CSV table of C-alpha atoms in Angstrom, one decimal:
chain,number,residue,atom,x,y,z
A,1,UNK,CA,-14.0,143.6,88.8
A,2,UNK,CA,-14.8,144.8,85.4
A,3,UNK,CA,-16.2,148.2,84.3
A,4,UNK,CA,-18.5,146.1,82.1
A,5,UNK,CA,-18.3,148.2,78.9
A,6,UNK,CA,-18.5,145.5,76.2
A,7,UNK,CA,-21.3,143.0,75.5
A,8,UNK,CA,-21.4,140.0,73.1
A,9,UNK,CA,-24.2,141.5,70.8
A,10,UNK,CA,-24.6,138.9,68.1
A,11,UNK,CA,-23.5,135.3,67.5
A,12,UNK,CA,-24.0,133.9,64.0
A,13,UNK,CA,-25.9,130.6,64.1
A,14,UNK,CA,-23.9,129.4,61.1
A,15,UNK,CA,-20.5,130.0,62.7
A,16,UNK,CA,-19.2,132.9,60.6
A,17,UNK,CA,-18.8,135.6,63.1
A,18,UNK,CA,-19.3,137.0,66.6
A,19,UNK,CA,-20.1,140.8,67.0
A,20,UNK,CA,-19.2,142.8,70.2
A,21,UNK,CA,-20.5,146.2,71.2
A,22,UNK,CA,-18.9,148.8,73.5
A,23,UNK,CA,-22.2,149.9,75.1
A,24,UNK,CA,-20.6,152.7,77.2
A,25,UNK,CA,-19.6,156.2,76.5
A,26,UNK,CA,-15.9,155.4,77.2
A,27,UNK,CA,-13.4,153.7,74.8
A,28,UNK,CA,-12.2,150.3,75.9
A,29,UNK,CA,-8.6,149.0,75.3
A,30,UNK,CA,-8.9,145.2,74.5
A,31,UNK,CA,-5.3,144.2,73.7
A,32,UNK,CA,-4.9,140.5,74.5
A,33,UNK,CA,-8.5,140.1,75.5
A,34,UNK,CA,-10.0,136.7,74.5
A,35,UNK,CA,-13.2,135.2,73.1
A,36,UNK,CA,-13.7,131.7,74.5
A,37,UNK,CA,-16.1,129.5,72.6
A,38,UNK,CA,-17.5,126.3,74.0
A,39,UNK,CA,-19.5,124.3,71.5
A,40,UNK,CA,-21.2,121.3,73.1
A,41,UNK,CA,-18.6,119.2,74.9
A,42,UNK,CA,-15.8,120.1,72.5
A,43,UNK,CA,-12.3,121.3,73.4
A,44,UNK,CA,-12.5,125.1,74.2
A,45,UNK,CA,-11.6,127.4,71.3
A,46,UNK,CA,-9.9,130.7,72.1
A,47,UNK,CA,-9.6,133.8,69.8
A,48,UNK,CA,-7.1,136.4,70.9
A,49,UNK,CA,-7.4,140.2,70.2
A,50,UNK,CA,-4.3,141.8,68.7
A,51,UNK,CA,-2.1,143.5,71.3
A,52,UNK,CA,-3.0,147.2,70.4
A,53,UNK,CA,-6.8,146.9,69.7
A,54,UNK,CA,-9.3,149.5,71.1
A,55,UNK,CA,-13.1,149.3,70.7
A,56,UNK,CA,-14.3,152.9,70.9
A,57,UNK,CA,-17.4,154.1,72.8
A,58,UNK,CA,-20.7,152.9,71.3
A,59,UNK,CA,-18.9,151.0,68.5
A,60,UNK,CA,-19.0,147.4,67.2
A,61,UNK,CA,-16.3,145.0,66.1
A,62,UNK,CA,-17.1,141.8,64.1
A,63,UNK,CA,-14.7,138.9,64.5
A,64,UNK,CA,-14.9,136.7,61.4
A,65,UNK,CA,-13.6,133.1,61.4
A,66,UNK,CA,-10.8,132.6,58.8
A,67,UNK,CA,-13.1,130.7,56.6
A,68,UNK,CA,-16.0,132.9,56.4
A,69,UNK,CA,-14.8,134.6,53.2
A,70,UNK,CA,-14.9,138.1,54.7
A,71,UNK,CA,-12.6,141.1,53.9
A,72,UNK,CA,-11.0,142.5,57.1
A,73,UNK,CA,-10.5,146.0,58.2
A,74,UNK,CA,-9.4,146.9,61.8
A,75,UNK,CA,-11.0,148.2,63.9
A,76,UNK,CA,-14.3,147.1,62.6
A,77,UNK,CA,-13.8,143.6,61.1
A,78,UNK,CA,-11.1,141.3,62.4
A,79,UNK,CA,-10.1,137.8,61.4
A,80,UNK,CA,-9.5,134.7,63.6
A,81,UNK,CA,-6.4,133.1,62.1
A,82,UNK,CA,-6.5,129.3,61.4
A,83,UNK,CA,-10.1,128.7,62.6
A,84,UNK,CA,-12.4,128.1,59.8
A,85,UNK,CA,-15.6,128.5,61.8
A,86,UNK,CA,-16.8,129.4,65.2
A,87,UNK,CA,-18.7,126.1,65.5
A,88,UNK,CA,-22.4,125.3,64.6
A,89,UNK,CA,-24.9,123.3,66.8
A,90,UNK,CA,-27.4,123.1,69.7
A,91,UNK,CA,-25.2,124.6,72.5
A,92,UNK,CA,-22.8,127.4,71.6
A,93,UNK,CA,-21.4,129.5,74.5
A,94,UNK,CA,-19.3,132.6,73.5
A,95,UNK,CA,-17.5,134.5,76.4
A,96,UNK,CA,-15.5,137.7,76.4
A,97,UNK,CA,-12.4,137.5,78.7
A,98,UNK,CA,-10.4,140.6,79.7
A,99,UNK,CA,-6.6,140.9,79.8
A,100,UNK,CA,-6.1,139.8,83.3
A,101,UNK,CA,-8.1,136.6,82.6
A,102,UNK,CA,-11.5,137.5,83.9
A,103,UNK,CA,-14.8,136.6,82.1
A,104,UNK,CA,-16.8,139.9,81.6
A,105,UNK,CA,-19.7,139.0,79.2
A,106,UNK,CA,-21.2,136.0,77.4
A,107,UNK,CA,-24.0,135.1,75.0
A,108,UNK,CA,-25.1,131.5,74.7
A,109,UNK,CA,-27.3,130.1,72.0
A,110,UNK,CA,-29.2,126.9,72.8
A,111,UNK,CA,-31.6,124.9,70.6
A,112,UNK,CA,-34.2,122.3,71.5
A,113,UNK,CA,-34.3,122.7,75.2
A,114,UNK,CA,-36.8,121.1,77.5
A,115,UNK,CA,-37.8,123.1,80.6
A,116,UNK,CA,-40.0,121.7,83.4
A,117,UNK,CA,-41.8,122.9,86.5
A,118,UNK,CA,-42.5,120.0,88.8
């Protein structure tokens, strides 16, 4: 179970950031929550939220890779230490995991997909 308050609102196609939105009218504590990023068949990458972070109702947080050149400012702009980019490519799955270890939201960008009806 999840109360489902947070969504993955935007994923940068050039790997610089991921943005999340608390779409509810209630604040959400996210200490030790994770963002799991699967790029193609690569080893899974995991970003960890600081232990005391809270995403207030209706607000956004942008998680910038260490190498994006951004200036950080909790609670709006956080940095992923020692990960230069989130990954760039034709299949990029970004999932939000809560503190207990459960996946509660995802956004996947796919390019050059062939769909059939046969």
